[PDB]
Amino acid sequence: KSDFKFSNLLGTVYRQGNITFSDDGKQLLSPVGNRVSVFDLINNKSFTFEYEHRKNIAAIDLNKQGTLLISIDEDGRAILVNFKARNVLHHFNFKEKCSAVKFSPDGRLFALASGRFLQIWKTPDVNKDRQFAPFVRHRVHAGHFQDITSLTWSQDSRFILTTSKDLSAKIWSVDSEEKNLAATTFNGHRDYVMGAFFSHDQEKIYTVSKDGAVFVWEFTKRKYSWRITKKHFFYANQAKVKCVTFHPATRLLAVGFTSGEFRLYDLPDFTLIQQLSMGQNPVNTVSVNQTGEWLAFGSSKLGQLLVYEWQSESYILKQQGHFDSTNSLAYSPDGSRVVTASEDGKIKVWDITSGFCLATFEEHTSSVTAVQFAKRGQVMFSSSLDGTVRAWDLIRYRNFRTFTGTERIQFNCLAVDPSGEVVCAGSLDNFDIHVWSVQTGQLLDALSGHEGPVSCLSFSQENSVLASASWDKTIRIWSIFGRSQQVEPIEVYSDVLALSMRPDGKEVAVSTLKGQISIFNIEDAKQVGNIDCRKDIISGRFNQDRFTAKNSERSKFFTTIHYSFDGMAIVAGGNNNSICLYDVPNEVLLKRFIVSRNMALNGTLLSTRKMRPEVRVTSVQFSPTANAFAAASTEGLLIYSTNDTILFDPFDLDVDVTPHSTVEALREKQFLNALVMAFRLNEEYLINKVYEAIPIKEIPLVASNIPAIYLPRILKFIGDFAIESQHIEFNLIWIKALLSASGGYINEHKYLFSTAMRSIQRFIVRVAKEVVNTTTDNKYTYRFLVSTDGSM
Amino acid sequence: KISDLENKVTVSAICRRRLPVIMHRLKMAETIQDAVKFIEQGHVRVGPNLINDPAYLVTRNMEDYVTWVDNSKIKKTLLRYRNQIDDFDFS
Amino acid sequence: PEGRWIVSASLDSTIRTWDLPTGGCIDGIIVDNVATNVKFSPNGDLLAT
Amino acid sequence: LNDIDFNTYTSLEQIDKELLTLSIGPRSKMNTLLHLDVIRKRSKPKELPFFLQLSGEKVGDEASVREGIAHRRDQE
Amino acid sequence: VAPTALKDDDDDVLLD
Amino acid sequence: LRIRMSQLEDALMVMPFSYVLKFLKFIDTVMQNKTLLHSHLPLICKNLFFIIKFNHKELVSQKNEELKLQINRVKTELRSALKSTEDDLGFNVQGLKFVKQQWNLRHN
Amino acid sequence: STRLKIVDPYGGSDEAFAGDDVVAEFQEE
Amino acid sequence: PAAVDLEIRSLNSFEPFDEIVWFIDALTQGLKSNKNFELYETFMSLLFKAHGDVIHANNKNQDIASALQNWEDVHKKEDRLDDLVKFCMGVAAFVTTA
Amino acid sequence: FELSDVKSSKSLAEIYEDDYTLSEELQKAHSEISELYANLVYKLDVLSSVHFVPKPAETPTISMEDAPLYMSNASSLAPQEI
Amino acid sequence: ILLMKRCRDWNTNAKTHTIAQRTIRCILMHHNIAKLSEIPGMVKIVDAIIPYTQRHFTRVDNLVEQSYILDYALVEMDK
């Protein structure tokens, strides 16, 4: 019963376009295909704008005021968005592919590189209300005979330098009166001109070409005219200049070469500050910080992004996304970390809070089909098409064990015992489930009985029963543990594609090729509910299709399903353009999400294969924090969260309940009532007010007297609040009071408080413990130094 | 063996694995031209996935599970002539 | 759309915004012609009358 | 009351002086300072004479080897 | 100057 | 000690509650014997914890005030007995690290 | 000249040459 | 985080070790504020990492010894948090399990 | 092994020079063979793949990817291993 | 030289580490650590003592956690 909104995209950090530093220098804007991701370098946080383009983004720029961001796609369609509020402002079409966009340093005007034509337009006022037709063109310039490679603004907002494919750099005057001041075309380059820049004093102009030559231009007598006083050359053996940037204040030239290496130079002396290689792929984009200490690099081929502090020779950011689509995803049991698997065969570990890749594994030769954690969470297991199942420690980041069949059986699904001692994997060719011993690595036995390939597997977290599904049109429940072995087959109407296990372990859901989600009672093996999905799914006609989408039967089934940890919801995904969230007890659709709207993706709307990328979702899972769910898709890992909570979703209001009324109860020292009243209103700001205003002395009194119904909610609030809050001791006092007073009730109903209490454990473990670990060693380190005898 | 691998591999062998070629052996279609029409119109599914491209080659493990699509009008004809149309299965 | 506000129009030629959490009118307008209809956009950025 | 008037609230810098409180910032900072050194070590990027003075078995002078006759300080 | 414009030597020989 | 670990938990699992109360009395008797406890502190701890987990809802039912006092003493000596061990472990590792660094500086 | 004049609803309301020494390069050739 | 380290070894290590004594009193006063706890704690750790040998060699010195003792006199007080964290997770570890 | 039966291009000083300054040629041969397989892997993949399959892809180099930075190598080794 | 060889071996076994730790504690506090670091072979023996000591420290700390079940008994049974 919660509202999920797209928050961020993990697994992809840069796809193409120009990266730009925020004016404050603390944030980096990386264009990610159809959207743009913003990274908080200082706070080490990341998020993605919700607004999206029709086609992959081409260019972006943010104003020095930091209020406006412009994004233009390959079709020239421009989207204007308020940076601060993250809301779209206006939609416009410039009707031509815009190579680059740059705001004037004043911010009043911005320039667009359109073919061989330069356009200068006026910036709308953010303060003014929404305008129907805000954009007005200041001027258009037609000097170049070929496409404009790039453009550079003067520091005074009076001149703009453009480098075009005519082997010519051409300067302009923003003011018509100042046309005589700057109406020069600079020639001499032997190859395409990449970048023209102004000196800080602006007397000197530096021009750079793809061949790797830098010309220094000065206005001097031979009466006065521009001349090439000095010439420099990049003597790269074969690498060609791909991107160039200049920082006039500190005189830095950062150049990315096509070989995949960049050089840092000091002008005009041409001193090579440093040279480094980020790989064999070309360096596509380079941007420089406002202060000039941080230099960011982007290569599209492997989707690489790196932020470099050349001052200290340190890496602020070093992140690279999957080359292939993410085949599967799995959250850490606490939800702090998520692991992703791609068709390449490489596994990457991501942190939810930071949104950054901590480590990557390359051991698997072929595509990794599935990934899963043990109940304890220290260990992660994976199965790949190469014919191996590999066990990974996430504390020490090592593959401590590998499992394989006798004949190198291809594995497509995997499941792990809650005890973390038995593993079961399934194959699309062998029809039999292989079982290994985690401790020993030997094949215990093979669970046979399926007349079809085993599509998916799962262990009950509590009962430890195994449920297996296939294209056999049946489900089999295996009681592997115990002196006696048994199999319980249940028949289903159609081929099974996906299976999810109830955290209680009493029910199982299965998705069939007919487009049905059927739920069965494990202990009895009878159906308990059935949900339709065929109508709800949205599938777009492919460009190659010769048959209509409505008549199409390509994908009206969900290839991945999972429950909510509370146990009342299912999120389902498949080879389609939709994510559907259902409400299990009564079989209805809660909400539906459009995974993508990129026109490039095929499903959005005799010698050669007509294959083009298509929108599809490989896997879906809920957050153990019960506030988000993530879906693996072609573009990357989409995460939808309920964090913002702008909705007013009260519980048990009465006329007496009012935000104003609550405050007197605080003023009237009636803390218990104020807390209960605030929860009834269910407003975070009011709850936070009451929570922080309760004195420490009265906490045990309030905790003992809280009604049972509000106990799960308050516990969830503290856990979610504490993980980022600074009042650990205040929070830790609250949990001690709550656990001491109501712990017995929690034990009586473990499932009701499962999600909330897990968040509490995360706070106690992932931050609180680290504090004492740093505190305790200092104490012992202290004692040794004082107690130990000093050296001779 | 490898020496066999040098000469065993042939264009005909690769063409033999062509899905349009294959179902002809399975007798789904009279002729290869009938086959390429059916796949383009979208009646033939390999495993759980629909294929509309003739040039697809079916690997051996998927060879068994090439079949028509459930709501194909063709299949409705298949069960009709043999008189086993079951409308619950919608096929 | 967020369920926090109610906007109502009446024959007295006024449009009033009501904040449900506090249960009070927060904004008031006077229209020349009585607004017979009022509707929020699904996004909420627009109000149609 | 303006915070109520805008349906917002800002957590206090410190609820009480006796109560311990950390810095107002990301929690990964503490980890970074403690292990800053190793981060630096990992982050570092990856790396004749005309009269040749050759003697011994390589030049066929096995007699010198039998009779017993047989650069880091440069690198520094 | 461009129209677009805005608006001791210590010896190295030493005693050891 | 003689009981095998593989069967310890089950032997402790077969334990009747009224008998369990007596096992707590035994742990008390061990506790006055400081040296004997220190010799075999870890094994005592695991058995106690499992028993408390085993009959947690029964123990809370018991309201004998004297039984509170038996419970209270078992820690403050146990906590002190434990607390000494980590401190000794903490003292060793810190100095042992420090000696490592000094040689490293000397040889690097 | 050198700036396009377009009369459109969105607009239309209202050279120096520098190069390298090629003759010296050619004389070098 | 770098700039914090850019300094901390740069602190001078002669006798009378005034700056080191000065810097220690800073962390001593900082802990008393009960604010920015983690940052203050990690700063002292870096001190021992960079100048621990300096401290141990002259641990008999009165000026340094007094500063350390006061820091302990503060530092001993914040051992309550150890009890609270260590209590809750055990009760938590039990409540979910049994 | 086969011994060359023709005149050696290198002069005795050159081979003596070579001695002064398992096999690089052997690792080169691995590289092409891996390259050939990657190309061959991609081709048979794309023809038999249901979905889109992307085509597989001095100076000091930055390590693009790591196996975490803050983690220490010593801490990654078990006491038994040490 | 002889002793820390023995304590190293003793430290490996959890059933006997406690004796080893106290002996190491005695030496560090009744000797000049500067002299210790100079002796050849200490560092290599000292190499092995860090990980096992850390393992023991990680353990036991966990046992004190399991002691805090008892607080729940007292507070609950106090009710």
PDB file of N, CA and C in Angstrom, chain C residues 3-49:
ATOM      1  N   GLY C   3      -3.345  14.188  -1.998  1.00  0.00           N
ATOM      2  CA  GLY C   3      -4.355  13.975  -0.983  1.00  0.00           C
ATOM      3  C   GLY C   3      -4.254  14.892   0.211  1.00  0.00           C
ATOM      4  N   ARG C   4      -3.479  15.971   0.112  1.00  0.00           N
ATOM      5  CA  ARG C   4      -3.262  16.878   1.228  1.00  0.00           C
ATOM      6  C   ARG C   4      -4.130  18.127   1.157  1.00  0.00           C
ATOM      7  N   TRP C   5      -4.600  18.499  -0.031  1.00  0.00           N
ATOM      8  CA  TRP C   5      -5.365  19.719  -0.228  1.00  0.00           C
ATOM      9  C   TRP C   5      -6.682  19.402  -0.918  1.00  0.00           C
ATOM     10  N   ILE C   6      -7.687  20.227  -0.633  1.00  0.00           N
ATOM     11  CA  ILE C   6      -8.953  20.215  -1.351  1.00  0.00           C
ATOM     12  C   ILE C   6      -9.229  21.630  -1.830  1.00  0.00           C
ATOM     13  N   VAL C   7      -9.567  21.763  -3.109  1.00  0.00           N
ATOM     14  CA  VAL C   7      -9.921  23.041  -3.714  1.00  0.00           C
ATOM     15  C   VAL C   7     -11.390  22.962  -4.099  1.00  0.00           C
ATOM     16  N   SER C   8     -12.164  23.968  -3.702  1.00  0.00           N
ATOM     17  CA  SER C   8     -13.600  23.982  -3.929  1.00  0.00           C
ATOM     18  C   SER C   8     -14.028  25.323  -4.502  1.00  0.00           C
ATOM     19  N   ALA C   9     -15.063  25.280  -5.338  1.00  0.00           N
ATOM     20  CA  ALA C   9     -15.663  26.463  -5.935  1.00  0.00           C
ATOM     21  C   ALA C   9     -17.148  26.495  -5.603  1.00  0.00           C
ATOM     22  N   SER C  10     -17.657  27.697  -5.343  1.00  0.00           N
ATOM     23  CA  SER C  10     -19.031  27.877  -4.898  1.00  0.00           C
ATOM     24  C   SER C  10     -19.665  29.032  -5.656  1.00  0.00           C
ATOM     25  N   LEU C  11     -20.988  29.139  -5.525  1.00  0.00           N
ATOM     26  CA  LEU C  11     -21.740  30.155  -6.249  1.00  0.00           C
ATOM     27  C   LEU C  11     -21.398  31.571  -5.814  1.00  0.00           C
ATOM     28  N   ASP C  12     -20.710  31.750  -4.690  1.00  0.00           N
ATOM     29  CA  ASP C  12     -20.281  33.077  -4.273  1.00  0.00           C
ATOM     30  C   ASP C  12     -19.090  33.593  -5.076  1.00  0.00           C
ATOM     31  N   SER C  13     -18.696  32.895  -6.143  1.00  0.00           N
ATOM     32  CA  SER C  13     -17.657  33.368  -7.056  1.00  0.00           C
ATOM     33  C   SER C  13     -16.292  33.385  -6.377  1.00  0.00           C
ATOM     34  N   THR C  14     -15.999  32.333  -5.616  1.00  0.00           N
ATOM     35  CA  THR C  14     -14.715  32.204  -4.945  1.00  0.00           C
ATOM     36  C   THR C  14     -14.212  30.775  -5.075  1.00  0.00           C
ATOM     37  N   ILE C  15     -12.890  30.642  -5.141  1.00  0.00           N
ATOM     38  CA  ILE C  15     -12.212  29.353  -5.144  1.00  0.00           C
ATOM     39  C   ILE C  15     -11.322  29.311  -3.913  1.00  0.00           C
ATOM     40  N   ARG C  16     -11.506  28.287  -3.085  1.00  0.00           N
ATOM     41  CA  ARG C  16     -10.852  28.194  -1.789  1.00  0.00           C
ATOM     42  C   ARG C  16     -10.033  26.915  -1.696  1.00  0.00           C
ATOM     43  N   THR C  17      -8.804  27.052  -1.204  1.00  0.00           N
ATOM     44  CA  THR C  17      -7.907  25.928  -0.981  1.00  0.00           C
ATOM     45  C   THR C  17      -7.930  25.564   0.496  1.00  0.00           C
ATOM     46  N   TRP C  18      -8.147  24.285   0.786  1.00  0.00           N
ATOM     47  CA  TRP C  18      -8.262  23.792   2.151  1.00  0.00           C
ATOM     48  C   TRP C  18      -7.157  22.783   2.422  1.00  0.00           C
ATOM     49  N   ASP C  19      -6.409  23.005   3.501  1.00  0.00           N
ATOM     50  CA  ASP C  19      -5.336  22.105   3.910  1.00  0.00           C
ATOM     51  C   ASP C  19      -5.904  21.094   4.897  1.00  0.00           C
ATOM     52  N   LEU C  20      -6.047  19.852   4.445  1.00  0.00           N
ATOM     53  CA  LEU C  20      -6.723  18.844   5.255  1.00  0.00           C
ATOM     54  C   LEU C  20      -6.016  18.543   6.570  1.00  0.00           C
ATOM     55  N   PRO C  21      -4.686  18.413   6.630  1.00  0.00           N
ATOM     56  CA  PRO C  21      -4.059  18.098   7.925  1.00  0.00           C
ATOM     57  C   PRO C  21      -4.441  19.066   9.028  1.00  0.00           C
ATOM     58  N   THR C  22      -4.497  20.363   8.730  1.00  0.00           N
ATOM     59  CA  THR C  22      -4.917  21.360   9.704  1.00  0.00           C
ATOM     60  C   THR C  22      -6.392  21.719   9.586  1.00  0.00           C
ATOM     61  N   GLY C  23      -7.060  21.301   8.515  1.00  0.00           N
ATOM     62  CA  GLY C  23      -8.483  21.569   8.377  1.00  0.00           C
ATOM     63  C   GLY C  23      -8.830  23.041   8.330  1.00  0.00           C
ATOM     64  N   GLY C  24      -8.093  23.819   7.549  1.00  0.00           N
ATOM     65  CA  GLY C  24      -8.371  25.232   7.404  1.00  0.00           C
ATOM     66  C   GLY C  24      -8.116  25.698   5.987  1.00  0.00           C
ATOM     67  N   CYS C  25      -8.800  26.775   5.613  1.00  0.00           N
ATOM     68  CA  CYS C  25      -8.622  27.368   4.295  1.00  0.00           C
ATOM     69  C   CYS C  25      -7.308  28.137   4.268  1.00  0.00           C
ATOM     70  N   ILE C  26      -6.468  27.845   3.276  1.00  0.00           N
ATOM     71  CA  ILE C  26      -5.144  28.451   3.197  1.00  0.00           C
ATOM     72  C   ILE C  26      -5.043  29.516   2.112  1.00  0.00           C
ATOM     73  N   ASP C  27      -5.777  29.377   1.012  1.00  0.00           N
ATOM     74  CA  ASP C  27      -5.783  30.381  -0.039  1.00  0.00           C
ATOM     75  C   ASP C  27      -7.212  30.628  -0.489  1.00  0.00           C
ATOM     76  N   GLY C  28      -7.470  31.862  -0.907  1.00  0.00           N
ATOM     77  CA  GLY C  28      -8.774  32.252  -1.400  1.00  0.00           C
ATOM     78  C   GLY C  28      -8.667  33.085  -2.658  1.00  0.00           C
ATOM     79  N   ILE C  29      -9.621  32.914  -3.569  1.00  0.00           N
ATOM     80  CA  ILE C  29      -9.629  33.620  -4.842  1.00  0.00           C
ATOM     81  C   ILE C  29     -11.035  34.147  -5.077  1.00  0.00           C
ATOM     82  N   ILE C  30     -11.133  35.187  -5.899  1.00  0.00           N
ATOM     83  CA  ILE C  30     -12.409  35.720  -6.360  1.00  0.00           C
ATOM     84  C   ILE C  30     -12.382  35.711  -7.879  1.00  0.00           C
ATOM     85  N   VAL C  31     -13.266  34.932  -8.476  1.00  0.00           N
ATOM     86  CA  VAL C  31     -13.346  34.798  -9.925  1.00  0.00           C
ATOM     87  C   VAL C  31     -14.505  35.641 -10.433  1.00  0.00           C
ATOM     88  N   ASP C  32     -14.320  36.252 -11.604  1.00  0.00           N
ATOM     89  CA  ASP C  32     -15.393  37.042 -12.197  1.00  0.00           C
ATOM     90  C   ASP C  32     -16.607  36.176 -12.509  1.00  0.00           C
ATOM     91  N   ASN C  33     -16.383  34.990 -13.067  1.00  0.00           N
ATOM     92  CA  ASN C  33     -17.442  34.052 -13.405  1.00  0.00           C
ATOM     93  C   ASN C  33     -17.330  32.822 -12.518  1.00  0.00           C
ATOM     94  N   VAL C  34     -18.470  32.385 -11.978  1.00  0.00           N
ATOM     95  CA  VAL C  34     -18.476  31.240 -11.078  1.00  0.00           C
ATOM     96  C   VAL C  34     -17.866  30.034 -11.774  1.00  0.00           C
ATOM     97  N   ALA C  35     -16.964  29.352 -11.074  1.00  0.00           N
ATOM     98  CA  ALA C  35     -16.277  28.185 -11.612  1.00  0.00           C
ATOM     99  C   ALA C  35     -17.140  26.956 -11.356  1.00  0.00           C
ATOM    100  N   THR C  36     -17.776  26.447 -12.412  1.00  0.00           N
ATOM    101  CA  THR C  36     -18.663  25.302 -12.250  1.00  0.00           C
ATOM    102  C   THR C  36     -17.892  23.997 -12.082  1.00  0.00           C
ATOM    103  N   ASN C  37     -16.643  23.938 -12.545  1.00  0.00           N
ATOM    104  CA  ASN C  37     -15.839  22.730 -12.435  1.00  0.00           C
ATOM    105  C   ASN C  37     -14.441  23.073 -11.947  1.00  0.00           C
ATOM    106  N   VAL C  38     -13.833  22.116 -11.253  1.00  0.00           N
ATOM    107  CA  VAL C  38     -12.441  22.197 -10.827  1.00  0.00           C
ATOM    108  C   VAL C  38     -11.869  20.789 -10.840  1.00  0.00           C
ATOM    109  N   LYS C  39     -10.664  20.636 -11.384  1.00  0.00           N
ATOM    110  CA  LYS C  39     -10.033  19.330 -11.482  1.00  0.00           C
ATOM    111  C   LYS C  39      -8.521  19.483 -11.433  1.00  0.00           C
ATOM    112  N   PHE C  40      -7.875  18.622 -10.655  1.00  0.00           N
ATOM    113  CA  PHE C  40      -6.423  18.560 -10.610  1.00  0.00           C
ATOM    114  C   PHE C  40      -5.893  17.690 -11.738  1.00  0.00           C
ATOM    115  N   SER C  41      -4.695  18.023 -12.202  1.00  0.00           N
ATOM    116  CA  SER C  41      -3.995  17.148 -13.114  1.00  0.00           C
ATOM    117  C   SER C  41      -3.455  15.940 -12.352  1.00  0.00           C
ATOM    118  N   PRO C  42      -3.269  14.805 -13.032  1.00  0.00           N
ATOM    119  CA  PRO C  42      -2.659  13.654 -12.345  1.00  0.00           C
ATOM    120  C   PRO C  42      -1.313  13.985 -11.729  1.00  0.00           C
ATOM    121  N   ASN C  43      -0.507  14.799 -12.411  1.00  0.00           N
ATOM    122  CA  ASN C  43       0.762  15.234 -11.839  1.00  0.00           C
ATOM    123  C   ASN C  43       0.547  16.286 -10.760  1.00  0.00           C
ATOM    124  N   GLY C  44      -0.524  17.069 -10.873  1.00  0.00           N
ATOM    125  CA  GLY C  44      -0.806  18.128  -9.929  1.00  0.00           C
ATOM    126  C   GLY C  44      -0.210  19.470 -10.283  1.00  0.00           C
ATOM    127  N   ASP C  45       0.627  19.536 -11.318  1.00  0.00           N
ATOM    128  CA  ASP C  45       1.178  20.812 -11.752  1.00  0.00           C
ATOM    129  C   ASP C  45       0.122  21.730 -12.354  1.00  0.00           C
ATOM    130  N   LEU C  46      -1.021  21.187 -12.770  1.00  0.00           N
ATOM    131  CA  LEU C  46      -2.054  21.955 -13.447  1.00  0.00           C
ATOM    132  C   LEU C  46      -3.377  21.814 -12.709  1.00  0.00           C
ATOM    133  N   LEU C  47      -4.156  22.893 -12.721  1.00  0.00           N
ATOM    134  CA  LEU C  47      -5.515  22.898 -12.197  1.00  0.00           C
ATOM    135  C   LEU C  47      -6.439  23.431 -13.279  1.00  0.00           C
ATOM    136  N   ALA C  48      -7.442  22.638 -13.643  1.00  0.00           N
ATOM    137  CA  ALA C  48      -8.371  22.971 -14.713  1.00  0.00           C
ATOM    138  C   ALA C  48      -9.698  23.409 -14.113  1.00  0.00           C
ATOM    139  N   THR C  49     -10.219  24.534 -14.594  1.00  0.00           N
ATOM    140  CA  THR C  49     -11.476  25.084 -14.111  1.00  0.00           C
ATOM    141  C   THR C  49     -12.304  25.586 -15.282  1.00  0.00           C
TER     142      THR C  49
END
